Amino acid sequence: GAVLSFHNICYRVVEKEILSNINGIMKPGLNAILGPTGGGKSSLLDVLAARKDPSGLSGDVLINGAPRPANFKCNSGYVVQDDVVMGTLTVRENLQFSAALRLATTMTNHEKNERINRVIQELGLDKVADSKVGTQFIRGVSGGERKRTSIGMELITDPSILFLDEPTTGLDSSTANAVLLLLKRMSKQGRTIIFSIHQPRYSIFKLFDSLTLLASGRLMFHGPAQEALGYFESAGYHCEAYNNPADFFLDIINGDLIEKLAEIYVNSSFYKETKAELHQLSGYTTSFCHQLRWVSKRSFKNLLGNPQASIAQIIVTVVLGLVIGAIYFGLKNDSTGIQNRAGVLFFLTTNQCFSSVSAVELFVVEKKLFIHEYISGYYRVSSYFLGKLLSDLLPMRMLPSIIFTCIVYFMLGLKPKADAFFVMMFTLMMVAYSASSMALAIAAGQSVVSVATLLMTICFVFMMIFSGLLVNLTTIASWLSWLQYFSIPRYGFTALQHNEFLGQNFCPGLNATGNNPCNYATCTGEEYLVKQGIDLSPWGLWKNHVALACMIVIFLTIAYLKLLFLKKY
Amino acid sequence: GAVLSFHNICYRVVEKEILSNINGIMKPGLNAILGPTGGGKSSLLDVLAARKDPSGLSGDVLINGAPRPANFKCNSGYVVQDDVVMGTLTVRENLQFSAALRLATTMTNHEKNERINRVIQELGLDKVADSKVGTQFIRGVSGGERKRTSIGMELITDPSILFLDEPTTGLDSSTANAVLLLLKRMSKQGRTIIFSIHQPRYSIFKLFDSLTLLASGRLMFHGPAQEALGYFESAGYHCEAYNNPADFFLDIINGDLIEKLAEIYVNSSFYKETKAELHQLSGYTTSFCHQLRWVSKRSFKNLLGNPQASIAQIIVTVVLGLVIGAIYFGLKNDSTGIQNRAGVLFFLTTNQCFSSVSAVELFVVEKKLFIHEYISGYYRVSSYFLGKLLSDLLPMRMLPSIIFTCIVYFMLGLKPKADAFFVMMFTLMMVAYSASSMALAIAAGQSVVSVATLLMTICFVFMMIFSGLLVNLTTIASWLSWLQYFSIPRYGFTALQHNEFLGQNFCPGLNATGNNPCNYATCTGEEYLVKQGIDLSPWGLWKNHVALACMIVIFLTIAYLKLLFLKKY
Ligand SMILES: CC[C@@]1(O)C(=O)OCc2c1cc1n(c2=O)Cc2cc3c(CN(C)C)c(O)ccc3nc2-1
Ligand SMILES: Nc1ncnc2c1ncn2[C@@H]1O[C@H](COP(=O)(O)OP(=O)(O)OP(=O)(O)O)[C@@H](O)[C@H]1O
Ligand SMILES: Nc1ncnc2c1ncn2[C@@H]1O[C@H](COP(=O)(O)OP(=O)(O)OP(=O)(O)O)[C@@H](O)[C@H]1O
Ligand SMILES: CC(C)CCC[C@@H](C)[C@H]1CC[C@H]2[C@@H]3CC=C4C[C@@H](O)CC[C@]4(C)[C@H]3CC[C@]12C
Ligand SMILES: CC(C)CCC[C@@H](C)[C@H]1CC[C@H]2[C@@H]3CC=C4C[C@@H](O)CC[C@]4(C)[C@H]3CC[C@]12C
């Protein structure tokens, strides 16, 4: 099988050392890593799996007599403590996704289906193959079945070496025993299993083949688990009956010293033998389009399977549209036309902007899953970005603009032409895309959602002040005027005003005989636009969409560069 | 000491029964309640402590031979699974609060200080008496010390009977052993301790005096913990060595049936004896002002000790004020005066309204603590309400109005009089109070903050539409006009407009010789007000503050009635 031999490890993580001097050999079977919570057990596991940065590593990890290959992460499985499976998807769907992106595309779909069937049969999930996994807060298969599902996702590719972080934490005692019996059955086949656990039971402990006890980043013991109790008893720490030996081992460390125990081990017979053995030993699959298609498919299934959020936004949009159509019904070309028109346009623009602060959750929620799957070799950092946008961003943001315009444009009696209807729709869509893109840029590469939401809201109100309606931008002083070019709402609102007010007359029965509206009237739409600082040329309408497009590109590029330089280790 | 004898309990919680037929006697010592998670162990604990509604209870709880007194909850302590201590306060401060509200006011402060010193010495917290407890996510004393602090808060009043829900869950093994040794020391004094635990160790289990095993709402065993293993072994379920007997007992239930075990117990020698014994046995301190003072003091200390949130809001307010003063600097009485004035007033009003959706967290965050302390007899439901308002609501909402007005009123060149400055300040303060009150009304008596925040934002935008600026309320149709009287921003904005536009002239060099501004000019402020639908009489300014005050009263009363009828059991 495989023999993962680590020798003289020292990891320095501010320069702290969480693993000091750890050497051992993990032969095939069911190997273990025990110790207190603060001990470097998960850290050692990651070090052996190469899921940790090589910066601090100061030792030689050597598998089956040769240095670790570059494709080790891809050829070896790793199971997370908290399952990352997609609740909205069916078990077989998740297994199909993993098979699609990990296994070679040369394999035909029939062969992959056979492989998935084999794995499902082995884990014993055949009954619940076609059932939704569930969020573990939402209803679905049981927690043990979710854990089995994760194990299967990693088992698709026939891994020789398999790592497991806390396989039994949060599971019930019966479920935990079931999981570990399953792992023992897997190990009898020759697959080397390496895992870390917390507070095991003697029924569990009786199944181990090797034991690695860690405390405060030091090696208290490495050897067969059966002989560990004899070793400690020989050291003088006698054990009482009806006491789980694992608890006794932890108790010795707790003191109910550490360097003394480490030296005792160094003088053991299990250390010189291990030294002799170690001295003897020492001296992308898939194309870009495939990744994009599958990640987009998974995202769309997640969107449909959990429709509570999207449906609510659609409902709110429709209700607001029907209310606004009734309130502003029958806009008139009289003294009060200007106020109502400007007000409705302002409201639509700001509603499109402030409703886009819900895009911060697009990447924040799925951060751990993204990191795990990138390290495991599922996909590139580009395909994830493009697919997630194409699935979760384009349609949701493209809908509200269409709904609003179709509902309100003819109830309100706005311009009766077709050239203007689609300009309005396009303008609103671009505003929404730009605002959502700015949200992604700020919120990308973060795990906390609160701060990003606060920042987004503050920035948007500051932008909204510098829109035309509230301040008359021609009045603002020079040393603060330039801030208006950094406003998303300004461009959209200006475009809508240019589209609507060009041609209207708001003076009933002027008769223009004296030709004098008293110069303080605002009798015509063009006069209002010029007094507001807007340009009546056609370029004045499109120099706003140009800016919105450029802002979209800039923000999306920033978000990509933030995901690409994120720390994934 | 005390002998809490329960007999023939049946609790029906939709009519489900989670406790079927449970009888037992809990003599002085260190008694226990074990079983699986789904078993009614916490439910039984609450039933014995009277923290559960008497509706479902169908049995006789009898303490020391007499029915439970009405003041039982006050004379008996109860410790929650998740500690509710205030992190922002020092240990001694929390103990002082509990002593102030639980112990009689007749006791002098010197005696109470001596009592607190005794308790601190007993628990062994003397070293960390003057250290902040911490949130357990923020730095502070260790988790074990927080648990000891809770135990002390309950131990202030010298309870004869003491209840503990999961005293050791989340604690480290060494810390758990320390806590339980402390409880054993307390029990040797004659105090009857009753507690529920999960997955104990044999070191812990060796300390028990009585055992009560529950599974699926049925009594598997009640008797001395020492004899339990012999009982089960006699039943045929032999036990292996190096296995914790608690785990063996749970394993028997897991099956690695229940009615069979219950019948076996009914035929036991520990059941007839208990029946014989049971048959033998059967056949506000403080004034309102004190409560208000102390709850307000605690709230203020919590506000100062965690200043990250308040400081940020103050900073945002100041920054916005200084930006707005620069943008709108030197308002002129010309064609563009009306727009800028109306815009700034609108912005200030809506900023005061939308910034008050952060008040939903005032009561949502401290819901569990409020319920626990009300049931324990700390305070009334009125004193908590008034004190929490007086501490957390009045100052925070009263500051921003003052800051905004003082900064901007003279930079913008608004009315140069004093009568108007304070009208503006008062108007803004009332708007903020009314909006925050409406937030409290909706969010009161809830544990989830998301839904309330969404509702608040939606209601506020709907209100903002019906303000004067965007819609010209004189245009709206009759069957929808009446919705304007339910708008908080409308009243404030109308008041500010009435205060500012009354007397201004926005037509430079009219010369009024022909006396014709063309009737479409809006040459004067009064003309703008009347065209907007506002009343120029002085009553038109104050009929808005009257409405705001009435809304404040209505919403606060609603919130109180929602807290008073909340389910606390
Ligand atoms: C339109 C008034 C105002 O622009 C202002 O000038 O003062 C401050 C402020 C405003 C609007 C909004 N907010 C504010 O703080 C928060 C907010 C949330 C909104 C939401 C909820 N977002 C947080 C996504 C909507 O769905 C639609 C419109 C929304 N409008 C606003
Ligand atoms: N990236 C890091 N930065 C700083 N300290 C770290 C980092 N990774 C580990 N450590 C430290 O190394 C020590 C070991 O932590 P460790 O990972 O082993 O926790 P664990 O409880 O044993 O893991 P698990 O519960 O998942 O099995 C800790 O003190 C931890 O703070
Ligand atoms: N107010 C309630 N409404 C509905 N069901 C309830 C209520 N209180 C308890 N139950 C039910 O009674 C059963 C027992 O739950 P229980 O309180 O004992 O959980 P527990 O794990 O044992 O408590 P703990 O962990 O804190 O020690 C559960 O099925 C629970 O859903
Ligand atoms: C760099 C980051 C922070 C994003 C900021 C980009 C902003 C400031 C840039 C991006 C593209 C720019 C626009 C590009 C084209 C023109 C047309 C010109 O006739 C007027 C200015 C205008 C309208 C620019 C204004 C500033 C602008 C909107
Ligand atoms: C239960 C909730 C919705 C409370 C909101 C109640 C509102 C609708 C009530 C409370 C007090 C009321 C005001 C009381 C006094 C007057 C003066 C009168 O000359 C005009 C109406 C006006 C201004 C009322 C309008 C409606 C009003 C503001």
Tab-separated table of C-alpha atoms in Angstrom, chain A residues 33-249:
chain	number	residue	atom	x	y	z
A	33	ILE	CA	-3.905	11.325	15.889
A	34	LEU	CA	-5.046	12.072	19.441
A	35	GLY	CA	-4.443	14.836	21.935
A	36	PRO	CA	-5.976	17.898	23.563
A	37	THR	CA	-7.709	20.602	21.571
A	38	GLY	CA	-4.734	22.960	21.699
A	39	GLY	CA	-2.376	20.245	20.515
A	40	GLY	CA	-1.243	20.290	16.920
A	41	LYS	CA	-3.310	17.383	15.628
A	42	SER	CA	-5.265	19.156	12.892
A	43	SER	CA	-2.085	21.083	12.107
A	44	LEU	CA	-0.112	17.858	11.719
A	45	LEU	CA	-2.887	16.424	9.567
A	46	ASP	CA	-2.789	19.434	7.247
A	47	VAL	CA	1.013	19.295	7.148
A	48	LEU	CA	0.905	15.679	6.002
A	49	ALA	CA	-1.826	16.428	3.451
A	50	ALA	CA	0.043	19.480	2.065
A	51	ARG	CA	-2.913	21.741	2.936
A	52	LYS	CA	-0.521	24.046	4.823
A	53	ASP	CA	1.958	26.574	3.505
A	54	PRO	CA	5.506	25.218	2.986
A	55	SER	CA	6.925	28.361	4.612
A	56	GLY	CA	7.051	26.998	8.156
A	57	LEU	CA	7.658	23.356	7.308
A	58	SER	CA	11.182	22.274	8.250
A	59	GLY	CA	11.096	18.501	7.754
A	60	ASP	CA	10.914	15.722	5.193
A	61	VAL	CA	7.543	14.163	4.399
A	62	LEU	CA	8.244	11.061	2.323
A	63	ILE	CA	5.554	8.739	0.969
A	64	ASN	CA	6.365	5.140	0.035
A	65	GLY	CA	10.076	5.942	-0.015
A	66	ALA	CA	9.999	8.901	-2.412
A	67	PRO	CA	9.360	12.634	-1.999
A	68	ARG	CA	5.780	13.790	-2.261
A	69	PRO	CA	4.715	14.242	-5.903
A	70	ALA	CA	3.406	17.574	-7.122
A	71	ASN	CA	-0.040	16.041	-7.743
A	72	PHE	CA	-0.325	14.694	-4.194
A	73	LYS	CA	-3.271	16.895	-3.207
A	74	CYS	CA	-5.152	15.648	-6.263
A	75	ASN	CA	-4.358	11.965	-5.689
A	76	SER	CA	-5.155	12.045	-1.946
A	77	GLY	CA	-8.502	12.771	-0.356
A	78	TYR	CA	-9.267	15.079	2.533
A	79	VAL	CA	-12.512	15.311	4.492
A	80	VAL	CA	-13.406	18.490	6.347
A	81	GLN	CA	-14.654	18.612	9.926
A	82	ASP	CA	-17.755	20.592	8.943
A	83	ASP	CA	-19.304	19.100	5.822
A	84	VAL	CA	-19.413	21.387	2.786
A	85	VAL	CA	-21.900	19.337	0.750
A	86	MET	CA	-24.671	21.272	-0.975
A	87	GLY	CA	-27.949	20.769	0.856
A	88	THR	CA	-30.065	21.977	-2.054
A	89	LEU	CA	-28.700	19.188	-4.262
A	90	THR	CA	-29.443	15.489	-4.216
A	91	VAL	CA	-26.759	13.090	-2.981
A	92	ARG	CA	-26.225	11.599	-6.423
A	93	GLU	CA	-25.941	15.111	-7.854
A	94	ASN	CA	-23.049	16.008	-5.550
A	95	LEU	CA	-21.293	12.736	-6.334
A	96	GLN	CA	-21.867	13.412	-10.036
A	97	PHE	CA	-20.317	16.875	-9.702
A	98	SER	CA	-17.228	15.512	-7.960
A	99	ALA	CA	-16.877	12.763	-10.565
A	100	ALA	CA	-17.254	15.283	-13.379
A	101	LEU	CA	-14.510	17.623	-12.185
A	102	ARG	CA	-12.062	15.212	-10.514
A	103	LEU	CA	-12.164	12.208	-12.841
A	104	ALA	CA	-10.809	12.537	-16.353
A	105	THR	CA	-13.112	13.697	-19.126
A	106	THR	CA	-11.826	10.793	-21.231
A	107	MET	CA	-14.037	8.496	-19.161
A	108	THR	CA	-17.512	8.124	-20.620
A	109	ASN	CA	-20.601	9.023	-18.616
A	110	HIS	CA	-21.593	5.352	-18.382
A	111	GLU	CA	-18.330	4.467	-16.636
A	112	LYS	CA	-18.677	7.412	-14.256
A	113	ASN	CA	-22.237	6.361	-13.437
A	114	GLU	CA	-20.980	2.857	-12.658
A	115	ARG	CA	-18.280	4.310	-10.402
A	116	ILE	CA	-20.859	6.410	-8.554
A	117	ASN	CA	-23.073	3.351	-8.122
A	118	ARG	CA	-20.158	1.394	-6.655
A	119	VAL	CA	-19.366	4.166	-4.178
A	120	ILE	CA	-22.998	4.565	-3.116
A	121	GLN	CA	-23.304	0.820	-2.569
A	122	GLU	CA	-20.097	0.738	-0.514
A	123	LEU	CA	-21.173	3.561	1.796
A	124	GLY	CA	-24.673	2.138	2.207
A	125	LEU	CA	-26.461	5.265	0.955
A	126	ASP	CA	-28.393	3.446	-1.781
A	127	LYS	CA	-31.707	4.129	-0.040
A	128	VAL	CA	-31.161	7.904	0.178
A	129	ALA	CA	-29.364	8.330	-3.157
A	130	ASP	CA	-32.250	10.355	-4.614
A	131	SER	CA	-32.976	12.467	-1.513
A	132	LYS	CA	-31.908	16.049	-0.904
A	133	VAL	CA	-29.013	16.250	1.533
A	134	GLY	CA	-30.313	19.183	3.556
A	135	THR	CA	-28.529	22.043	5.283
A	136	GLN	CA	-28.390	20.167	8.623
A	137	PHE	CA	-30.477	23.050	9.898
A	138	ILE	CA	-33.071	22.399	7.200
A	139	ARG	CA	-34.601	18.951	6.879
A	140	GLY	CA	-32.918	16.216	4.882
A	141	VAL	CA	-30.828	13.102	5.310
A	142	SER	CA	-29.355	12.454	8.742
A	143	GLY	CA	-26.033	13.910	9.829
A	144	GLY	CA	-24.293	10.561	9.541
A	145	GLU	CA	-25.491	10.250	5.956
A	146	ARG	CA	-24.144	13.726	5.180
A	147	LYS	CA	-20.760	12.660	6.540
A	148	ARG	CA	-20.888	9.475	4.469
A	149	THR	CA	-21.689	11.647	1.452
A	150	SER	CA	-18.568	13.750	1.982
A	151	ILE	CA	-16.481	10.598	2.338
A	152	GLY	CA	-17.908	9.357	-0.954
A	153	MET	CA	-17.167	12.624	-2.731
A	154	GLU	CA	-13.532	12.107	-1.775
A	155	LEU	CA	-13.632	8.355	-2.509
A	156	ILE	CA	-14.737	8.813	-6.127
A	157	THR	CA	-11.172	8.920	-7.453
A	158	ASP	CA	-9.912	5.783	-5.667
A	159	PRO	CA	-7.511	7.528	-3.263
A	160	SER	CA	-4.634	5.493	-1.878
A	161	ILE	CA	-4.263	7.820	1.130
A	162	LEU	CA	-7.327	9.315	2.810
A	163	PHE	CA	-7.363	12.039	5.463
A	164	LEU	CA	-10.206	12.827	7.854
A	165	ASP	CA	-10.457	15.774	10.243
A	166	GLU	CA	-12.632	14.925	13.254
A	167	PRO	CA	-14.778	12.346	11.443
A	168	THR	CA	-16.973	11.983	14.552
A	169	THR	CA	-17.766	15.361	16.118
A	170	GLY	CA	-21.398	16.305	16.596
A	171	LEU	CA	-22.516	12.814	15.592
A	172	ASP	CA	-24.400	10.587	17.994
A	173	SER	CA	-22.557	7.742	19.687
A	174	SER	CA	-24.335	5.087	17.622
A	175	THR	CA	-23.763	7.094	14.445
A	176	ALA	CA	-20.101	7.590	15.350
A	177	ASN	CA	-19.618	3.856	15.885
A	178	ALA	CA	-21.277	3.203	12.527
A	179	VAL	CA	-18.988	5.675	10.754
A	180	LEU	CA	-15.843	4.212	12.294
A	181	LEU	CA	-16.900	0.644	11.511
A	182	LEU	CA	-17.334	1.799	7.916
A	183	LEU	CA	-13.819	3.245	7.977
A	184	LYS	CA	-12.470	-0.040	9.336
A	185	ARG	CA	-14.133	-1.878	6.455
A	186	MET	CA	-12.503	0.558	4.024
A	187	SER	CA	-9.109	0.062	5.687
A	188	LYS	CA	-9.253	-3.734	5.456
A	189	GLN	CA	-9.031	-3.233	1.674
A	190	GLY	CA	-5.529	-1.741	1.970
A	191	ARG	CA	-6.415	1.958	1.934
A	192	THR	CA	-4.315	3.933	4.427
A	193	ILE	CA	-6.652	6.051	6.552
A	194	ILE	CA	-5.304	8.885	8.703
A	195	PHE	CA	-7.602	10.842	10.983
A	196	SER	CA	-7.849	12.987	14.097
A	197	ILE	CA	-10.524	12.523	16.755
A	198	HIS	CA	-11.646	13.971	20.080
A	199	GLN	CA	-12.802	12.106	23.193
A	200	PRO	CA	-13.052	8.599	21.697
A	201	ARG	CA	-14.705	5.635	23.372
A	202	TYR	CA	-13.028	2.327	24.123
A	203	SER	CA	-15.258	0.646	21.542
A	204	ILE	CA	-13.841	3.058	18.971
A	205	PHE	CA	-10.321	2.863	20.398
A	206	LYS	CA	-10.247	-0.926	20.100
A	207	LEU	CA	-10.277	-0.596	16.300
A	208	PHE	CA	-7.101	1.467	15.863
A	209	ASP	CA	-3.892	0.173	14.297
A	210	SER	CA	-1.539	3.055	15.144
A	211	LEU	CA	-1.623	5.866	17.696
A	212	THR	CA	-0.007	9.322	17.593
A	213	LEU	CA	-0.453	11.284	20.805
A	214	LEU	CA	0.250	15.015	20.695
A	215	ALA	CA	0.320	17.660	23.408
A	216	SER	CA	1.377	21.307	23.067
A	217	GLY	CA	3.093	20.579	19.765
A	218	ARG	CA	5.176	17.667	21.033
A	219	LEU	CA	5.131	13.912	20.486
A	220	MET	CA	4.150	12.050	23.642
A	221	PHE	CA	3.795	8.678	21.912
A	222	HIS	CA	3.841	6.988	18.526
A	223	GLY	CA	3.298	3.274	18.101
A	224	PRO	CA	0.666	0.554	18.100
A	225	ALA	CA	-2.413	1.581	20.036
A	226	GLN	CA	-2.563	-1.777	21.816
A	227	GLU	CA	0.866	-1.292	23.416
A	228	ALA	CA	0.293	2.326	24.478
A	229	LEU	CA	-1.334	1.385	27.775
A	230	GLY	CA	1.495	-0.990	28.623
A	231	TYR	CA	4.010	1.739	27.837
A	232	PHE	CA	2.359	4.284	30.124
A	233	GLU	CA	1.896	1.713	32.892
A	234	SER	CA	5.589	0.837	32.650
A	235	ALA	CA	6.321	4.557	32.965
A	236	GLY	CA	4.597	4.404	36.368
A	237	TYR	CA	1.224	5.953	35.460
A	238	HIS	CA	-0.991	3.057	36.490
A	239	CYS	CA	-4.598	3.060	35.287
A	240	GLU	CA	-7.824	2.246	37.104
A	241	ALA	CA	-10.534	-0.068	35.834
A	242	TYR	CA	-13.724	1.068	34.104
A	243	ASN	CA	-11.708	3.989	32.710
A	244	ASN	CA	-11.373	4.530	28.978
A	245	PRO	CA	-7.642	4.354	28.124
A	246	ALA	CA	-7.952	7.384	25.845
A	247	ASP	CA	-9.250	9.415	28.777
A	248	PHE	CA	-6.390	8.074	30.897
A	249	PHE	CA	-3.845	9.178	28.289
